[model samples]
Target: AFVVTDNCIKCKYTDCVEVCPVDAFYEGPNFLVIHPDECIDCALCEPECPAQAIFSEDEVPEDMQEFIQLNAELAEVWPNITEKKDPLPDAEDWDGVKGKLQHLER
Candidate 1:
Protein backbone atom coordinates (compact mmCIF):
# COMPACT_ATOMS: atom_id res chain seq x y z
CA ALA A 1 0.00 0.00 0.00
CA PHE A 2 1.09 3.53 -0.68
CA VAL A 3 0.54 6.06 2.06
CA VAL A 4 -0.42 9.69 1.77
CA THR A 5 1.66 11.96 3.97
CA ASP A 6 1.73 15.43 5.53
CA ASN A 7 2.39 17.37 2.35
CA CYS A 8 -1.06 16.31 1.10
CA ILE A 9 -2.89 17.77 4.05
CA LYS A 10 -3.57 21.16 2.49
CA CYS A 11 -2.45 20.66 -1.07
CA LYS A 12 -5.24 18.18 -1.88
CA TYR A 13 -4.13 17.72 -5.44
CA THR A 14 -6.25 14.90 -6.92
CA ASP A 15 -3.77 13.94 -9.59
CA CYS A 16 -2.89 10.81 -7.65
CA VAL A 17 -6.53 9.82 -7.52
CA GLU A 18 -6.80 9.81 -11.29
CA VAL A 19 -3.93 7.43 -11.82
CA CYS A 20 -4.74 4.92 -9.12
CA PRO A 21 -5.69 1.74 -10.93
CA VAL A 22 -7.56 0.43 -7.93
CA ASP A 23 -9.37 3.67 -7.16
CA ALA A 24 -8.10 3.42 -3.61
CA PHE A 25 -8.09 7.15 -2.84
CA TYR A 26 -10.49 8.69 -0.35
CA GLU A 27 -11.38 12.35 0.02
CA GLY A 28 -11.20 14.43 3.17
CA PRO A 29 -12.13 18.06 3.77
CA ASN A 30 -8.64 19.19 2.83
CA PHE A 31 -6.71 16.04 2.10
CA LEU A 32 -6.71 12.59 0.50
CA VAL A 33 -5.79 9.16 1.79
CA ILE A 34 -5.21 5.79 0.20
CA HIS A 35 -7.08 2.78 1.48
CA PRO A 36 -4.47 0.34 2.65
CA ASP A 37 -6.52 -2.74 1.86
CA GLU A 38 -7.61 -1.43 -1.49
CA CYS A 39 -4.17 -0.46 -2.75
CA ILE A 40 -2.54 -3.18 -4.89
CA ASP A 41 1.05 -2.01 -4.47
CA CYS A 42 0.97 -0.41 -7.88
CA ALA A 43 3.28 2.58 -8.09
CA LEU A 44 1.33 4.75 -10.50
CA CYS A 45 0.00 7.32 -8.06
CA GLU A 46 3.23 8.22 -6.30
CA PRO A 47 4.87 10.37 -8.95
CA GLU A 48 1.62 12.04 -9.97
CA CYS A 49 1.50 14.09 -6.78
CA PRO A 50 2.95 17.54 -7.30
CA ALA A 51 3.89 17.67 -3.64
CA GLN A 52 5.57 14.25 -3.76
CA ALA A 53 3.46 13.13 -0.85
CA ILE A 54 2.87 9.47 -1.67
CA PHE A 55 5.25 6.66 -0.73
CA SER A 56 5.14 2.92 -0.53
CA GLU A 57 4.27 1.61 2.90
CA ASP A 58 7.79 0.31 3.45
CA GLU A 59 9.59 3.19 1.80
CA VAL A 60 7.59 5.93 3.54
CA PRO A 61 9.92 8.54 4.95
CA GLU A 62 10.76 8.19 8.63
CA ASP A 63 9.38 11.62 9.51
CA MET A 64 6.14 10.99 7.66
CA GLN A 65 5.67 7.51 9.09
CA GLU A 66 2.54 8.44 10.95
CA PHE A 67 0.70 8.89 7.69
CA ILE A 68 0.68 5.15 7.12
CA GLN A 69 -1.78 4.93 9.96
CA LEU A 70 -3.48 8.21 9.10
CA ASN A 71 -4.33 6.97 5.62
CA ALA A 72 -5.98 3.85 6.97
CA GLU A 73 -7.86 5.79 9.63
CA LEU A 74 -9.07 8.53 7.30
CA ALA A 75 -10.02 6.18 4.50
CA GLU A 76 -12.61 4.50 6.64
CA VAL A 77 -14.49 7.78 7.06
CA TRP A 78 -13.90 9.69 3.81
CA PRO A 79 -15.67 8.90 0.56
CA ASN A 80 -13.82 7.40 -2.33
CA ILE A 81 -12.58 9.89 -4.93
CA THR A 82 -11.44 8.41 -8.24
CA GLU A 83 -11.48 11.38 -10.56
CA LYS A 84 -9.07 14.24 -10.76
CA LYS A 85 -10.08 17.64 -9.48
CA ASP A 86 -8.59 21.08 -8.99
CA PRO A 87 -6.34 21.39 -6.00
CA LEU A 88 -7.05 23.54 -2.98
CA PRO A 89 -7.06 27.28 -3.78
CA ASP A 90 -3.84 27.77 -1.85
CA ALA A 91 -2.28 24.44 -2.72
CA GLU A 92 0.82 26.06 -4.16
CA ASP A 93 1.35 28.09 -1.02
CA TRP A 94 0.96 25.03 1.17
CA ASP A 95 2.93 22.53 -0.91
CA GLY A 96 6.09 21.31 0.83
CA VAL A 97 5.10 23.09 4.04
CA LYS A 98 6.04 21.20 7.20
CA GLY A 99 3.78 20.24 10.10
CA LYS A 100 0.65 20.32 7.95
CA LEU A 101 -1.04 17.66 10.04
CA GLN A 102 -2.09 20.49 12.35
CA HIS A 103 -4.18 21.87 9.48
CA LEU A 104 -5.83 18.56 8.56
CA GLU A 105 -9.61 18.84 8.85
CA ARG A 106 -10.65 15.26 9.50
Candidate 2:
Protein backbone atom coordinates (compact mmCIF):
# COMPACT_ATOMS: atom_id res chain seq x y z
CA ALA A 1 0.00 0.00 0.00
CA PHE A 2 1.08 3.58 -0.65
CA VAL A 3 0.65 6.27 1.98
CA VAL A 4 -0.38 9.84 1.31
CA THR A 5 1.95 12.01 3.33
CA ASP A 6 2.40 15.58 4.50
CA ASN A 7 2.56 16.85 0.96
CA CYS A 8 -1.09 15.93 0.77
CA ILE A 9 -2.09 17.13 4.19
CA LYS A 10 -2.96 20.57 2.87
CA CYS A 11 -2.57 20.28 -0.89
CA LYS A 12 -5.13 17.46 -1.19
CA TYR A 13 -4.20 16.85 -4.80
CA THR A 14 -6.34 14.24 -6.54
CA ASP A 15 -4.09 13.11 -9.36
CA CYS A 16 -3.51 9.85 -7.59
CA VAL A 17 -7.24 9.22 -7.26
CA GLU A 18 -7.70 9.78 -10.95
CA VAL A 19 -5.58 6.84 -11.99
CA CYS A 20 -6.01 4.41 -9.15
CA PRO A 21 -7.52 1.42 -10.87
CA VAL A 22 -8.85 0.28 -7.50
CA ASP A 23 -10.45 3.54 -6.37
CA ALA A 24 -8.41 3.26 -3.21
CA PHE A 25 -8.36 6.86 -1.99
CA TYR A 26 -10.50 8.09 0.88
CA GLU A 27 -11.33 11.79 0.98
CA GLY A 28 -11.19 14.02 4.00
CA PRO A 29 -11.70 17.76 4.47
CA ASN A 30 -8.10 18.63 3.54
CA PHE A 31 -6.37 15.40 2.68
CA LEU A 32 -6.68 12.04 1.03
CA VAL A 33 -5.58 8.57 2.08
CA ILE A 34 -5.20 5.26 0.30
CA HIS A 35 -7.16 2.21 1.38
CA PRO A 36 -4.39 -0.25 2.03
CA ASP A 37 -6.56 -3.30 1.64
CA GLU A 38 -7.86 -2.04 -1.66
CA CYS A 39 -4.59 -0.95 -3.23
CA ILE A 40 -3.03 -3.38 -5.64
CA ASP A 41 0.45 -1.87 -5.23
CA CYS A 42 -0.05 -0.68 -8.76
CA ALA A 43 2.66 1.93 -9.20
CA LEU A 44 0.36 4.06 -11.35
CA CYS A 45 -0.40 6.63 -8.67
CA GLU A 46 3.20 7.33 -7.65
CA PRO A 47 4.49 9.63 -10.43
CA GLU A 48 1.06 11.21 -10.78
CA CYS A 49 1.47 13.17 -7.53
CA PRO A 50 2.68 16.67 -8.32
CA ALA A 51 3.63 17.19 -4.70
CA GLN A 52 5.44 13.83 -4.64
CA ALA A 53 3.29 12.79 -1.72
CA ILE A 54 2.61 9.13 -2.34
CA PHE A 55 5.12 6.49 -1.33
CA SER A 56 5.18 2.72 -1.27
CA GLU A 57 4.78 1.43 2.31
CA ASP A 58 8.44 0.63 2.92
CA GLU A 59 9.63 3.74 1.15
CA VAL A 60 7.57 6.08 3.31
CA PRO A 61 9.53 8.32 5.66
CA GLU A 62 9.87 8.03 9.40
CA ASP A 63 8.01 11.27 10.06
CA MET A 64 5.27 10.22 7.71
CA GLN A 65 5.01 6.70 9.08
CA GLU A 66 1.88 7.31 11.10
CA PHE A 67 0.00 7.96 7.92
CA ILE A 68 0.19 4.33 6.96
CA GLN A 69 -2.12 3.55 9.86
CA LEU A 70 -3.95 6.81 9.44
CA ASN A 71 -4.85 5.88 5.89
CA ALA A 72 -6.46 2.62 6.84
CA GLU A 73 -8.32 4.11 9.75
CA LEU A 74 -9.79 6.89 7.66
CA ALA A 75 -10.52 4.62 4.75
CA GLU A 76 -13.13 2.92 6.85
CA VAL A 77 -15.17 6.07 7.38
CA TRP A 78 -14.40 8.56 4.61
CA PRO A 79 -16.10 8.33 1.27
CA ASN A 80 -14.24 6.96 -1.70
CA ILE A 81 -13.20 9.65 -4.16
CA THR A 82 -12.31 8.13 -7.51
CA GLU A 83 -11.86 11.03 -9.88
CA LYS A 84 -9.39 13.86 -10.18
CA LYS A 85 -10.50 17.13 -8.67
CA ASP A 86 -9.17 20.62 -8.12
CA PRO A 87 -6.52 20.97 -5.48
CA LEU A 88 -6.84 23.22 -2.45
CA PRO A 89 -6.75 26.90 -3.45
CA ASP A 90 -3.36 27.35 -1.80
CA ALA A 91 -1.98 24.00 -2.79
CA GLU A 92 1.08 25.44 -4.48
CA ASP A 93 1.88 27.59 -1.48
CA TRP A 94 1.66 24.59 0.84
CA ASP A 95 3.58 22.18 -1.31
CA GLY A 96 6.94 21.12 0.17
CA VAL A 97 6.11 22.78 3.45
CA LYS A 98 6.83 20.55 6.43
CA GLY A 99 4.76 19.72 9.53
CA LYS A 100 1.41 19.50 7.81
CA LEU A 101 0.03 16.67 9.88
CA GLN A 102 -1.40 19.07 12.42
CA HIS A 103 -3.17 20.91 9.63
CA LEU A 104 -5.15 17.94 8.42
CA GLU A 105 -8.89 18.29 8.87
CA ARG A 106 -11.39 15.53 9.30
Candidate 3:
Protein backbone atom coordinates (compact mmCIF):
# COMPACT_ATOMS: atom_id res chain seq x y z
CA ALA A 1 0.00 0.00 0.00
CA PHE A 2 1.10 3.57 -0.64
CA VAL A 3 0.93 5.79 2.46
CA VAL A 4 0.66 9.57 2.51
CA THR A 5 3.26 11.17 4.76
CA ASP A 6 3.42 14.60 6.35
CA ASN A 7 4.47 16.08 3.02
CA CYS A 8 0.83 16.25 2.00
CA ILE A 9 -0.54 18.18 4.95
CA LYS A 10 -1.09 21.43 3.05
CA CYS A 11 0.11 20.65 -0.44
CA LYS A 12 -3.29 19.30 -1.30
CA TYR A 13 -2.80 19.16 -5.05
CA THR A 14 -4.78 16.22 -6.35
CA ASP A 15 -2.33 15.07 -9.00
CA CYS A 16 -1.89 11.74 -7.29
CA VAL A 17 -5.60 11.22 -6.91
CA GLU A 18 -6.25 12.21 -10.49
CA VAL A 19 -3.81 9.66 -11.86
CA CYS A 20 -4.83 6.81 -9.62
CA PRO A 21 -6.58 4.18 -11.71
CA VAL A 22 -8.27 2.71 -8.68
CA ASP A 23 -9.38 5.94 -7.03
CA ALA A 24 -7.80 4.73 -3.81
CA PHE A 25 -7.17 8.05 -2.11
CA TYR A 26 -9.47 9.26 0.68
CA GLU A 27 -9.73 12.89 1.78
CA GLY A 28 -8.61 13.99 5.22
CA PRO A 29 -8.91 17.19 7.21
CA ASN A 30 -5.57 18.42 5.94
CA PHE A 31 -4.57 16.05 3.20
CA LEU A 32 -5.32 12.75 1.56
CA VAL A 33 -4.45 9.10 2.14
CA ILE A 34 -4.43 5.90 0.15
CA HIS A 35 -6.85 3.14 1.06
CA PRO A 36 -4.58 0.21 1.81
CA ASP A 37 -7.02 -2.38 0.60
CA GLU A 38 -7.97 -0.47 -2.52
CA CYS A 39 -4.49 0.32 -3.79
CA ILE A 40 -3.23 -1.93 -6.53
CA ASP A 41 0.40 -1.23 -5.62
CA CYS A 42 1.07 -0.29 -9.21
CA ALA A 43 3.19 2.62 -7.97
CA LEU A 44 1.69 5.02 -10.48
CA CYS A 45 0.50 7.42 -7.82
CA GLU A 46 3.94 7.74 -6.26
CA PRO A 47 5.34 9.83 -9.09
CA GLU A 48 2.17 11.88 -9.29
CA CYS A 49 2.37 13.24 -5.73
CA PRO A 50 3.58 16.83 -5.94
CA ALA A 51 5.03 16.86 -2.45
CA GLN A 52 6.52 13.42 -2.93
CA ALA A 53 4.36 12.37 -0.02
CA ILE A 54 3.39 8.95 -1.22
CA PHE A 55 5.52 6.02 -0.10
CA SER A 56 5.15 2.31 -0.10
CA GLU A 57 4.52 0.81 3.32
CA ASP A 58 8.07 -0.49 3.45
CA GLU A 59 9.72 2.61 2.02
CA VAL A 60 8.53 5.32 4.40
CA PRO A 61 11.38 7.33 5.92
CA GLU A 62 11.97 7.38 9.65
CA ASP A 63 10.83 10.95 10.21
CA MET A 64 7.57 10.42 8.38
CA GLN A 65 5.97 8.88 11.42
CA GLU A 66 2.24 8.24 11.79
CA PHE A 67 1.74 8.02 8.04
CA ILE A 68 0.96 4.34 8.16
CA GLN A 69 -1.81 4.70 10.67
CA LEU A 70 -3.02 7.97 9.24
CA ASN A 71 -3.61 6.41 5.86
CA ALA A 72 -5.60 3.60 7.39
CA GLU A 73 -7.59 5.66 9.84
CA LEU A 74 -8.59 8.40 7.42
CA ALA A 75 -10.02 5.90 5.01
CA GLU A 76 -12.74 5.12 7.49
CA VAL A 77 -14.15 8.61 7.84
CA TRP A 78 -13.64 9.96 4.30
CA PRO A 79 -16.61 10.39 2.04
CA ASN A 80 -16.94 8.07 -0.93
CA ILE A 81 -15.64 9.18 -4.34
CA THR A 82 -19.21 9.26 -5.59
CA GLU A 83 -19.94 12.16 -3.27
CA LYS A 84 -17.69 14.47 -5.24
CA LYS A 85 -18.88 16.21 -8.39
CA ASP A 86 -16.43 18.97 -9.08
CA PRO A 87 -13.73 18.28 -11.61
CA LEU A 88 -10.24 17.70 -10.25
CA PRO A 89 -8.12 20.81 -10.20
CA ASP A 90 -5.34 21.23 -12.72
CA ALA A 91 -1.84 20.25 -11.63
CA GLU A 92 0.49 22.08 -13.98
CA ASP A 93 2.17 23.86 -11.07
CA TRP A 94 2.43 20.73 -9.01
CA ASP A 95 4.83 18.78 -11.19
CA GLY A 96 8.23 18.06 -9.68
CA VAL A 97 7.18 19.93 -6.54
CA LYS A 98 9.09 19.74 -3.27
CA GLY A 99 9.32 21.07 0.29
CA LYS A 100 7.65 20.09 3.53
CA LEU A 101 3.98 20.80 4.22
CA GLN A 102 4.80 23.70 6.52
CA HIS A 103 1.59 25.57 5.82
CA LEU A 104 -0.43 22.93 7.61
CA GLU A 105 1.58 23.38 10.80
CA ARG A 106 0.38 26.94 11.15
Best candidate, lDDT-wise?
Answer: 1
**Lowest summed lDDT over 10 consecutive residues: which window, candidate 2?**
9-18
Global lDDT for candidate 3? 0.69
Model 3 per-residue lDDT tens digits across residues 44-106? 988977667789999998877567886787788785452333322433343334444453331
Name the regions of candidate 3 deviating beyond 4 angstroms: 81-106
Candidate 1 error regions (>4 Å): none
Among all windows of 10 consecutive residues in model 3, the one with the lowest summed lDDT is: 82-91
In candidate 1, clashing pairs total 0
Q: Report per-prediction Cα RMSD to one decimal.
A: 0.7, 0.7, 4.4
| Pairs clashing within candidate 3 | none
lDDT of 2 at 47: 95
Model 1 agreement with the true structure over 1-106: per-residue lDDT tens digits: 9998899888998999877888999999999999999999989999899999999999998888889998999899999998898999999999988999989997
lDDT of each: 0.91, 0.90, 0.69
**lDDT at residue 55 of model 3 (Cα atoms):** 94
Model 2 Cα RMSD, 1 decimal: 0.7
The superposed Cα distance between candidate 1 and the true structure at residue 66, in angstroms, equals 1.0
Error of 3 at 11 (Å): 1.1
TM agreement with the true structure for every prediction: 0.97, 0.96, 0.74
Task: Please count the clashing residue pairs in each candidate, in the order shown.
Answer: 0, 0, 0
Error of 2 at 53 (Å): 0.5
